[PDB]
Amino acid sequence: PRVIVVGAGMSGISAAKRLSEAGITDLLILEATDHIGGRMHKTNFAGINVELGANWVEGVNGGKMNPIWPIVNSTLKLRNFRSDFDYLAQNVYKEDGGVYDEDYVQKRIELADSVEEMGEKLSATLHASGRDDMSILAMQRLNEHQPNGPATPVDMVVDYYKFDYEFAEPPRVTSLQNTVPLATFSDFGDDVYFVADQRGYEAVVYYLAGQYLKTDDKSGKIVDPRLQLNKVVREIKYSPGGVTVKTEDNSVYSADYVMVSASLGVLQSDLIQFKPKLPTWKVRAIYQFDMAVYTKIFLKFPRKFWPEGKGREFFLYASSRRGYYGVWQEFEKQYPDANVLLVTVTDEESRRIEQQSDEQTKAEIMQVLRKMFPGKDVPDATDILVPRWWSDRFYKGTFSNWPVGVNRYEYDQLRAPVGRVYFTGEHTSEHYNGYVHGAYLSGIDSAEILINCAQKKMC
Amino acid sequence: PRVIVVGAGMSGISAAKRLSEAGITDLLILEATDHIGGRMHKTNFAGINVELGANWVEGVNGGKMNPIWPIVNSTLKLRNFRSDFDYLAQNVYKEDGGVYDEDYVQKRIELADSVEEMGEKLSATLHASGRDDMSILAMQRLNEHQPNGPATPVDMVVDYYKFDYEFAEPPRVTSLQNTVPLATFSDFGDDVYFVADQRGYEAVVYYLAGQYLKTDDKSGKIVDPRLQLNKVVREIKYSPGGVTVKTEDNSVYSADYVMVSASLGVLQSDLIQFKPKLPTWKVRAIYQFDMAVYTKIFLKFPRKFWPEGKGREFFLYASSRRGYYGVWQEFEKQYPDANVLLVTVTDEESRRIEQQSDEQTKAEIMQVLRKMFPGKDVPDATDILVPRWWSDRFYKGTFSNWPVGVNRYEYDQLRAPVGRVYFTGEHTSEHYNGYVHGAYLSGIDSAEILINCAQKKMCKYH
Ligand SMILES: Cc1cc2nc3c(=O)[nH]c(=O)nc-3n(C[C@H](O)[C@H](O)[C@H](O)COP(=O)(O)OP(=O)(O)OC[C@H]3O[C@@H](n4cnc5c(N)ncnc54)[C@H](O)[C@@H]3O)c2cc1C
Numbered sequence: 006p007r008v009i010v011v012g013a014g015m016s017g018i019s020a021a022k023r024l025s026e027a028g029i030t031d032l033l034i035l036e037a038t039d040h041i042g043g044r045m046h047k048t049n050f051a052g053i054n055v056e057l058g059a060n061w062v063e064g065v066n067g068g069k070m071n072p073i074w075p076i077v078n079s080t081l082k083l084r085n086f087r088s089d090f091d092y093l094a095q096n097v098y099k100e101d102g103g104v105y106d107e108d109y110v111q112k113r114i115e116l117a118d119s120v121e122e123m124g125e126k127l128s129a130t131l132h133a134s135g136r137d138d139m140s141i142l143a144m145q146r147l148n149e150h151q152p153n154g155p156a157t158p159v160d161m162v163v164d165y166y167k168f169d170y171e172f173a174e175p176p177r178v179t180s181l182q183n184t185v186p187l188a189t190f191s192d193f194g195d196d197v198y199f200v201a202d203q204r205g206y207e208a209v210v211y212y213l214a215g216q217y218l219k220t221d222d223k224s225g226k227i228v229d230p231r232l233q234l235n236k237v238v239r240e241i242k243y244s245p246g247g248v249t250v251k252t253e254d255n256s257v258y259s260a261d262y263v264m265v266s267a268s269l270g271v272l273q274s275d276l277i278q279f280k281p282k283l284p285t286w287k288v289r290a291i292y293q294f295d296m297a298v299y300t301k302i303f304l305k306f307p308r309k310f311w312p313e314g315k316g317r318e319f320f321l322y323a324s325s326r327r328g329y330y331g332v333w334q335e336f337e338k339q340y341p342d343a344n345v346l347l348v349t350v351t352d353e354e355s356r357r358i359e360q361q362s363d364e365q366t367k368a369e370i371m372q373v374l375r376k377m378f379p380g381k382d383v384p385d386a387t388d389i390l391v392p393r394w395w396s397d398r399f400y401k402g403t404f405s406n407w408p409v410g411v412n413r414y415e416y417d418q419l420r421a422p423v424g425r426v427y428f429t430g431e432h433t434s435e436h437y438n439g440y441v442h443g444a445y446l447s448g449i450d451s452a453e454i455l456i457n458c459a460q461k462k463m464c
Numbered sequence: 465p466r467v468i469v470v471g472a473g474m475s476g477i478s479a480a481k482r483l484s485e486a487g488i489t490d491l492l493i494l495e496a497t498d499h500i501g502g503r504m505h506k507t508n509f510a511g512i513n514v515e516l517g518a519n520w521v522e523g524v525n526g527g528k529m530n531p532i533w534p535i536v537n538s539t540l541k542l543r544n545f546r547s548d549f550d551y552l553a554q555n556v557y558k559e560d561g562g563v564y565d566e567d568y569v570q571k572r573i574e575l576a577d578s579v580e581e582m583g584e585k586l587s588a589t590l591h592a593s594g595r596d597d598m599s600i601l602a603m604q605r606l607n608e609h610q611p612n613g614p615a616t617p618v619d620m621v622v623d624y625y626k627f628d629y630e631f632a633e634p635p636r637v638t639s640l641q642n643t644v645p646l647a648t649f650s651d652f653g654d655d656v657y658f659v660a661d662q663r664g665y666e667a668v669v670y671y672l673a674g675q676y677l678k679t680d681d682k683s684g685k686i687v688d689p690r691l692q693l694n695k696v697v698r699e700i701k702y703s704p705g706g707v708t709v710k711t712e713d714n715s716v717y718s719a720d721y722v723m724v725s726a727s728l729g730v731l732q733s734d735l736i737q738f739k740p741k742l743p744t745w746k747v748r749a750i751y752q753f754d755m756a757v758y759t760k761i762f763l764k765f766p767r768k769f770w771p772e773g774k775g776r777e778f779f780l781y782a783s784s785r786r787g788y789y790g791v792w793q794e795f796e797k798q799y800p801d802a803n804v805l806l807v808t809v810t811d812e813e814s815r816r817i818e819q820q821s822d823e824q825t826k827a828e829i830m831q832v833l834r835k836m837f838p839g840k841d842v843p844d845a846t847d848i849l850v851p852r853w854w855s856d857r858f859y860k861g862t863f864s865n866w867p868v869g870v871n872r873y874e875y876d877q878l879r880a881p882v883g884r885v886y887f888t889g890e891h892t893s894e895h896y897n898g899y900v901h902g903a904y905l906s907g908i909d910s911a912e913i914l915i916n917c918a919q920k921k922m923c924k925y926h
């Protein structure tokens with residue numbers, strides 16, 4: 006059968022690969038951008054390539070092998086380092102000058118961890134129907150016996166680092182049942198390894214794709230005509246007999262099936278018109294799940310003024326304004342001598358920030374850094390890079406997040422095809438939504454679902 | 465039967481009243497503070513009594529009579545004014561000065577409203593168990609077809625105005641099914657009347673209390689020994705045989721039943737120890753519901769620099785930072801010539817703000833005001849009042865908000881009695897949680913459940 010795959014991100018390439026492996030090779034991969042990889046995408050910043058999107062292989066060293074790890078660590082040997090968050094207590098900056106007492110912070114972290122652990126126990130007891138699910142915030146109130154969760158600046162930044170920095174939305178909107186504990190870590194291990202390779206984390210996608218798409222023997226570039234870049238799908242027309250897909254450049258294509266890999270955000274946006282309209286159950290499932298945004302703001306300085314050394318990689322800024330430029334990273338290992346800092350924000354801050362100029366953001370950041378390093382002569386960042394994923398119509402966000410209110414059945418409706426319209430992507434990952442490995446496995450499962458239906462008529 | 469009622473806010477006074485009415489007069493109302501009224505409470509600010517807490521009779525002029533209205537507007541004749549929000553479109557300030565074009569704003573309002581109305585239709589269809597509920601935000605995304613709800617400064621303050629300003633938590637945390645549409649408005653009417661009377665909205669509570677508790681003929685002060693103020697209940701021991709209640713000043717009382725009217729926030733804070741501990745199902749119901757915080761920041765100025773006149777009472781600041789000092793009210797009618805402004809914040813901002821000095825807050829607000837009225841010489845507020853309800857142990861917030869995640873059954877468990885321990889309060893209002901009328905009605909309802917057990921020996925609840 007001919008299958009059109011919309012999008013050449015991890016899941017699209019992964020799905021096409023799986024299809025090809027089932028022998029469905031009459032594929033047409035339509036990618037909106039001029040490159041493949043989607044959310045795994047590097048860029049030159051300050052003479053170095055940094056990841057605008059995914060940057061870690063998360064869930065390593067556990068009881069099950071994270072499928073991406075071997076590709077990263079062995080097959081491609083992409084340069085990488087395990088992140089050590091053990092020294093956070095030594096790196097929590099007071100809103101107005103210097104770090105807090107490490108012991109004080111370590112206890113706050115401990116309480117936080119302890120609470121989450123109790124949340125994990127509780128989570129295990131909830132009913133599969135999700136009927137007793139609650140937001141993580143609700144669990145925190147319950148375990149701490151307070152009418153609120155973390156509310157002091159230190160508690161909040163700890164909270165933000167523990168949750169928002171992972172999920173990109175606050176605990177209060179987050180489904181406890183579906184995030185605590187998280188399969189990714191529960192299955193693959195608690196370690197996470199930061200990929201810092203000039204080839205880019207995206208090399209993983211390119212590798213997969215080269216396993217079945219044609220590439221130039223010298224160039225190495227993919228030249229397979231089954232991959233068409235700069236093809237923005239804008240319409241997918243389907244019937245019991247097949248589908249037609251129209252691209253922004255006005256090309257029109259036909260196939261027996263279409264595998265949609267565009268992000269949940271893209272699906273929530275109307276960039277693609279389905280005709281007929283997706284059924285209500287589908288639409289509701291789509292709109293009920295969350296497409297989070299996680300913005301990696303890179304900054305380059307004329308000189309270092311922050312600490313480097315053991316436990317220095319990650320540091321938090323305990324602003325009284327929850328989530329305000331709170332999580333920082335310095336790359337003494339990754340990009341030795343670059344004088345680059347990375348501050349991450351999400352959700353509301355991400356949308357506010359994407360909406361203002363880089364200069365304005367730089368200026369806000371300079372004020373924070375100055376407040377952070379009052380003793381130093383903090384030079385103004387020479388360059389800043391503000392990824393605008395939510396604003397990018399081909400992503401409209403960085404990764405899904407599971408909100409309280411959505412249960413599994415409904416999450417699964419996300420994965421459900423509609424007639425000949427199949428879906429794949431991290432937000433369709435049965436247990437790894439939000440990750441590269443989730444996009445990866447999702448391409449596989451989605452393809453297998455189409456394969457059984459299409460090849461064995463077992464739908 | 466002797467009944468101890470914990471708390472003399474609206475629900476406790478209302479409950480005790482209903483009990484008294486069913487002939488249960490062997491009552492003891494233990495009030496933590498030196499006064500009754502709880503969340504209905506005024507205070508002198510810069511020479512005028514403004515309300516720290518409830519300020520409106522919400523839901524007026526509808527198909528059904530808000531029980532609170534007649535007392536306020538007729539029995540007591542408390543001074544009050546219908547809030548008119550029809551001119552908001554002319555009153556939305558730009559983060560960086562002046563107001564937005566009215567037509568532009570009106571359109572955004574109309575969109576917001578239309579999404580909401582579409583949400584009301586969806587809501588009607590949701591399974592009554594609450595099992596298909598979703599957040600208001602989800603409904604917004606669905607209807608706007610965006611991966612986010614309002615996200616520009618203007619749509620956001622409009623959204624905040626429409627929701628956070630009513631519920632004190634964001635749409636994304638709020639149960640659609642339980643708040644859109646809102647019964648208070650559907651049943652009692654869309655209007656709201658702001659009480660601006662030196663006697664305070666709490667007069668309603670003093671009035672009811674007075675219907676059954678003894679008062680001094682000249683002072684009119686309640687002098688009934690059944691009301692004991694400054695009695696903070698710290699422990700409630702209950703058994704098949706009865707209940708014992710202990711106050712912080714070591715007083716110990718015994719009764720057949722106890723009726724707890726303390727806020728959800730108090731319940732979530734362990735101020736009162738129950739012995740035996742409440743059942744897990746109860747505990748969970750308690751923690752899952754939300755106790756919101758709504759902070760009425762009053763500011764006093766040496767002179768007026770904002771507009772007054774038609775449609776001027778309410779104005780919004782379209783901050784690019786959602787919920788940042790966004791909803792303003794000027795008191796040309798309520799406190800004429802006082803030069804007071806009220807900016808309302810809730811939730812995260814409330815918590816942040818309660819935790820820092822009023823001076824710091826005032827300075828934040830001054831910068832906002834100067835950005836809003838760059839053409840004026842905005843004088844620094846000479847006075848500011850930041851109500852700290854979340855920090856107050858007898859309240860731990862302002863009012864409950866039904867969050868996405870609490871289902872019908874869970875909410876009922878929140879209300880359910882445990883043995884001889886009954887619960888009441890706005891957070892136990894079946895359809896009016898979060899309101900004065902909900903507290904009022906909840907008092908009567910819990911009283912009735914208690915009356916059936918006590919008088920009709922009908923003790924099984926749901
Ligand atoms: C900032 C950020 C941080 C993250 N952190 C990490 C991390 O450290 N570790 C981790 O494991 N995961 C992380 N993730 C999550 C991970 O990157 C994603 O889950 C994964 O790459 C999603 O791949 P996917 O194929 O589902 O979607 P995508 O990568 O979005 O692929 C979808 C593709 O469809 C294309 N497309 C969209 N619309 C159209 C259209 N109309 N027509 C045609 N093509 C279209 C897009 O251009 C894209 O190439 C991060 C992501 C981001 C963005």
Ligand SMILES: Cc1cc2nc3c(=O)[nH]c(=O)nc-3n(C[C@H](O)[C@H](O)[C@H](O)COP(=O)(O)OP(=O)(O)OC[C@H]3O[C@@H](n4cnc5c(N)ncnc54)[C@H](O)[C@@H]3O)c2cc1C
Pocket residue numbers: 470471472473474475476494495496497499500501502503504516517518519520521522695696697698725726727730735736758759760853857858859861862863888889890891898899900901902903
């Ligand atoms: C800032 C704010 C704004 C609001 N806006 C409005 C509005 O405009 N309109 C509206 O309808 N509603 C509004 N509400 C909600 C309304 O005021 C409340 O719903 C209602 O007053 C609550 O009454 P209650 O009896 O349920 O609780 P409360 O008024 O809290 O009564 C509980 C009583 O118990 C006391 N107590 C607590 N702990 C103990 C203890 N351990 N022992 C003894 N006594 C104890 C408390 O002191 C209090 O007196 C607002 C409330 C606040 C605070």
Ligand SMILES: *[C@@H]1O[C@H](CO)[C@@H](O[C@@H]2O[C@H](CO)[C@@H](O)[C@H](O)[C@H]2NC(C)=O)[C@H](O)[C@H]1NC(C)=O
Pocket residue numbers: 065066078079
């Ligand atoms: C990631 O890959 C490196 C690459 O080899 C691993 O380090 C090697 O592990 C083998 C296994 O016994 C040793 O014999 C080699 O001497 C090691 N090489 C180096 C350079 O140390 C490493 O353990 C891998 N990490 C994970 C998490 O799998």
Ligand SMILES: *[C@@H]1O[C@H](CO)[C@@H](O[C@@H]2O[C@H](CO)[C@@H](O)[C@H](O)[C@H]2NC(C)=O)[C@H](O)[C@H]1NC(C)=O
Pocket residue numbers: 524525537538
């Ligand atoms: C609030 O109360 C006032 C007090 O009566 C109401 O105004 C009275 O309404 C009757 C009804 O027609 C008139 O005959 C009186 O002349 C009115 N009095 C005044 C002073 O105008 C008023 O309508 C009430 N408002 C609401 C919303 O109930």
